[PDB]
Design a protein around this nucleic acid. Sequence first.
RNA 1: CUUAGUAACGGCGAGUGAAGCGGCAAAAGCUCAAAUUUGAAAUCUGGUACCUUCGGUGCCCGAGUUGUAAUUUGGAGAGGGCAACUUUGGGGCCGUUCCUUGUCUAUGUUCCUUGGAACAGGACGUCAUAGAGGGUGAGAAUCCCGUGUGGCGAGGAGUGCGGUUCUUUGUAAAGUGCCUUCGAAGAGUCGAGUUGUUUGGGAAUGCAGCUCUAAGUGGGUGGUUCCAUCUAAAGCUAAAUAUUGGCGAGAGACCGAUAGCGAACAAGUACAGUGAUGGAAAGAUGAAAAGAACUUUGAAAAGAGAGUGAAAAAGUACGU
RNA 2: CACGGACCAAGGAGUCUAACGUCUAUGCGAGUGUUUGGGUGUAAAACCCAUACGCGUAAUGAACGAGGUUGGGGCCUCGCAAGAGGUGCACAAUCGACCGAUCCUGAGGAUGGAUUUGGUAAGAGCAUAGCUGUUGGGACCCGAAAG
Lengths: 52, 51, 126, 8, 118, 125
Amino acid sequence: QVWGSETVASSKVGYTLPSHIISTSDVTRIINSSEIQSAIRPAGQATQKRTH
Amino acid sequence: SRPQVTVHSLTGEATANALPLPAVFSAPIRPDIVHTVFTSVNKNKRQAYAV
Amino acid sequence: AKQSLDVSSDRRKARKAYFTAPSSQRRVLLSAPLSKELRAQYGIKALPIRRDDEVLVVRGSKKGQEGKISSVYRLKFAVQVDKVTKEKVNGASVPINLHPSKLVITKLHLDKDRKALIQRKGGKLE
Amino acid sequence: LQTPAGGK
Amino acid sequence: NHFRKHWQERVKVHFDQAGKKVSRRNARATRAAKIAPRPLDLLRPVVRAPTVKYNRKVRAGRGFTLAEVKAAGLTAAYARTIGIAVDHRRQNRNQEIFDANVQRLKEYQSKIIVFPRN
Amino acid sequence: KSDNVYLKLLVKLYTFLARRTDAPFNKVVLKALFLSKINRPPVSVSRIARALKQEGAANKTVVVVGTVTDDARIFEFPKTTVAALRFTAGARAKIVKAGGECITLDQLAVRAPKGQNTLILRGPR
RNA sequence: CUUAGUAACGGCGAGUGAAGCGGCAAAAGCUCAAAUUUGAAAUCUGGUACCUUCGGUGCCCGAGUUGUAAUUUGGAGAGGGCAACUUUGGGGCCGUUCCUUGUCUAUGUUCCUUGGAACAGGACGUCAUAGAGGGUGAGAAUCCCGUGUGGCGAGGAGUGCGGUUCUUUGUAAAGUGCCUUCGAAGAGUCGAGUUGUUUGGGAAUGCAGCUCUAAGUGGGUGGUUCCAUCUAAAGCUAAAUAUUGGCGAGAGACCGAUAGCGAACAAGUACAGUGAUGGAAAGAUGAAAAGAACUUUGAAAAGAGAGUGAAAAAGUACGU
RNA sequence: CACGGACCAAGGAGUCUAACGUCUAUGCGAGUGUUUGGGUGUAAAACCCAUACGCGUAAUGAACGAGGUUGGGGCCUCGCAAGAGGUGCACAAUCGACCGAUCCUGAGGAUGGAUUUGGUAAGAGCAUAGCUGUUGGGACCCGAAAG
């Protein structure tokens, strides 16, 4: 009641709960999704073998 | 749904009664905002000094 | 936790109020605990100390010694127990300036005023 | 008797 | 700038603000203790402001006029002892304001209780 | 220059998507995140409706880097979905009541990693 | 607080600079003049004898009629008739509120280790509306002084009020409605012309001087042909308001002996000036001086042994 | 040349405030600004608030279509890449619209008719903090013929 979830009033007239700018903070989970992984091109070994 | 933390009696026994989260704990954690607000709130309790 | 606004907790104020406290207040300052043997009868935990009283030593190099109080030195907050003395290079005896807060009273004087105070502080002489 | 200043 | 004078000689920093609120609260508590039975403030009338930039806002007034007190079923001298402010230099012009003041006085009279002189 | 953890996470995700997809949409969106507040004026809901008024733009998705501010000069709103970092209470309520939907940049990337059918709008300068 | 750095001034250059209203802390209103008490100067200062002595009573003298008593003053008010109109003080005592002040109000000093010493480290227990602070040979809740907590007294202020009791009283004193007859307005003052000053205040903002001098259905200030507010030239008033001075308290993201008040100490002291005035430097031994007993060197300053102490790497010229 | 330097311990010089401005970080956003004040309080701490007020949102009373074209980040379609078309963000160029507003007019005394114009042409501002830009306050410090 003091903070006002979506289902109830906050009692702090003129205020509302903050809105997240990102749905999920786990970027790895989003990146490791099947859709993105299929749409993402393959990557290399991440280490450049020395040449000459 | 919204998980509910079980009520613990004075003896530490997990009582069957539980309450859903008030949704406040799902708010966006902003360490920068908290630090900036603290750096100014902590200055409100001060007394002036001069020579 | 302090609640009253009339009693300051400042270190400097307390030190000033003690380094120049009057002798009458110093009398209360020099209160000493009573031996549990006496505490069993009277119940009072502590009472002032005077010459006619008998006290025991529990702390310091003189720990374990006991004797009658020779004199009370309120100016330096020192209480001198009889038979507890230090011999100078010339052989002159000098009482050691003990503190009543470290001694324990083993025999209480029973002056009329002391007896009245015992009842005043919830005691019961028997 | 008058309206209270601020909140209640 | 507006600092060619010795402004530094008169700079009152309002450090008392924190303590001034507590002092005012203590004074109000003391008045309540002394004036326990009666309210801390007198019943003030409702009035309409001049200066059309603000006339649209209804606000309280200083004290009821003699005509309003007479229409309220009591007298100015008697009304003062009941806590109703009376203004001897205010003349009622608007009829709605007079009616509102009369209704407020009637409500106050109905809601008050006066202790016996005993 | 910002210090928001969520903003940094979104920047990292968009950089990864742009570098691992070569789609210019991701690069353009990420470049906008490196713009200061003055360089990111809000886009009014009226501007979003105007952009949707274009031929074939009703079915397209609209993405706003800045803040989607409400507008009192319009009553009807298209039943479209708007993705932006900051959504004002009035604009969000109007979009929800008009049958639309509001989502964050990460949700839009998940739905459209390459930004298919996406439209980018920016406020006037 | 805003108004507002606005209106407005400004060799219209620098700069100066309000006020209405609005938001809030507080509210208490009033007392005289001018009306005959005229069926009674009904008023009061002072001396004297008493008492229930911050004053009251009797007597006496005097002040006042060139005005002391009562009512009243723009909200008007006053002399009468009517309503079977409505009401009634002080003191003595106890308690209540407050000032000062005394007092009651918990628990280890239990063991192991060290250390000069326990407050220190470890082991085992207790109070906590008391874990704020100080002293006790080093960092102490439980050694003491102290704080939270309530509780018991004493000396005063007292009419802010809760009880008991004496007195009223007198064709005495008041309040509202109706009818009736009257119904009183502050002068060398407003104002005008001028000089000097000030104000944003040009519309001359006020002030002081100077020539003249005002009216009572009369007069000040402002606005559409008039209109709105008071009606001064007499006086009293608690609360918000300031506080580098005096008294007592609660505190500081302040300085810490070349810093901080000039003065942490023998500081407004020493010291200089025929004088108004100027004006400093200087803190620390150790727990207790336990401050060189005692032997020897020279007369001594002190030196060499011995001795106290945790330390003499503490020797009065002493924390480091 | 010269000003200063015998040596050493300490002290010592871009610090504070008022007004306006750019950039940067955060909140809200056509709204923003609690703390002049009230409630409250573990008591100068922290949490809420009515009413007014500073700024802008409508300029000097703005919907002929708040509009046509040229491009334009991106998107879509055609495609194996090149290549072609549509939509077209901000934005720029351009032809135009309405308000304030400028000459004719005639319906008895205003509409309308062509321009220009300073704005609208679909809000973007307020608040808290950091560096920084300019002026007044002793203004980096000691110091000058002194009323």
